[PDB]
């Protein structure tokens, strides 16, 4: 399913429950349904033409709430319906889908880091716990390529993390891979290709702009062309063989800035700009609803 | 504030 990039939720002020989709082919941003309950830190991802928000925290004038939600959005019906909620809440949450089933990995709760990852089921609405990570990671990215799913850099609760690591379903194993060149929490993490890119992110001194690919083949990081803009918590996605990286907060704005990386060209280009800036989105791509 | 996403703190 590929058609419109969806950004959910955010930060600006406070806790956003945005729900907007950007149309690439047209140039056109659509406002959909809100999300019953507003969230930042959150990660989106899309089964089986569904749209799933998942963990978070509510930033509100009314309090913090970390979120355990697993929300799921029907594009044909513009409706958000609850789903079964994780085992715990899960704030700077990463996700990633292996064969139609979502994994929910790290993120924080009140003052404790998780290293626990969570496998969901949708056509059982069942979550489950999987093997935990070797380290507690929150703001952590998360991608999968070839069937196996990528820790990314994060925070353990006392230092930013350049170390990632790699899961075997079918051995229900986390093994270590080559750490990156860059100290990165908050990147926004994807593939495209043979590669994981790890884009931006913040080092513990400054939002960053620069982008990293691991080869899995080689289990190496080299450096691509950076991002014009610094940006952290940045949401990201990929369509049409290219990166779209959508707002973050550059240590002085909360960007609305969409930039998008051609490969081919190893270029980025400004390509839209998000209805208003925040932080701490979740995004993913799906069919166009009515 | 947090640096990492902005957020109050």
């Known amino acids: ?290 | 504030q947090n640096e990492e996403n902005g957020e109050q703190e």
Request: proline fraction near 4%; aromatic fraction near 10%.
């Open chain 1, 1 to 290: 399913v590929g058609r419109l990039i969806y950004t959910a939720g955010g930060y600006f002020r406070q806790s956003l429950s945005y729900l907007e989709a950007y149309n690439p082919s047209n140039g056109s941003w659509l406002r959909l349904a809100d999300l019953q309950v507003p969230r930042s830190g959150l990660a989106g991802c899309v089964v089986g033409g569904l749209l799933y928000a998942v963990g978070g925290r509510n930033n509100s004038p009314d309090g913090n709430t970390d979120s355990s939600a697993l929300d799921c959005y029907n594009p044909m019906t513009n409706q958000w319906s609850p789903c079964a909620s994780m085992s715990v809440p899960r704030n700077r949450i990463g996700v990633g889908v292996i064969d139609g089933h979502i994994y929910a990995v790290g993120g924080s709760h009140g003052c404790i880091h998780h290293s626990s990852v969570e496998r969901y089921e949708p056509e059982r609405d069942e979550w489950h716990l999987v093997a935990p990570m070797l380290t507690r990671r929150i703001g952590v990215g998360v991608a999968v390529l070839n069937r196996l799913l990528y820790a990314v850099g994060g925070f353990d609760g006392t230092n930013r993390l350049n170390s990632a690591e790699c899961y075997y379903p079918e051995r229900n194993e986390w093994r270590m891979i080559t750490p990156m060149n860059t100290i990165r929490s908050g990147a926004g993490v994807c593939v495209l290709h043979n590669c994981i890119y790890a884009a931006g992110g913040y080092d513990g001194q400054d939002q960053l702009n620069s982008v990293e690919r691991y080869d899995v083949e080689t289990e190496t990081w080299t450096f691509v062309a950076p991002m014009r803009h610094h940006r952290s918590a940045l949401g990201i996605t990929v369509h049409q063989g290219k990166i779209y990286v959508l707002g973050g907060y550059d240590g002085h704005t909360f960007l609305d800035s969409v930039e998008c990386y051609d490969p081919d060209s190893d270029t980025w280009s400004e390509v839209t700009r998000m209805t208003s800036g925040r932080s701490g989105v979740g995004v993913a791509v799906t069919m166009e609803p009515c």
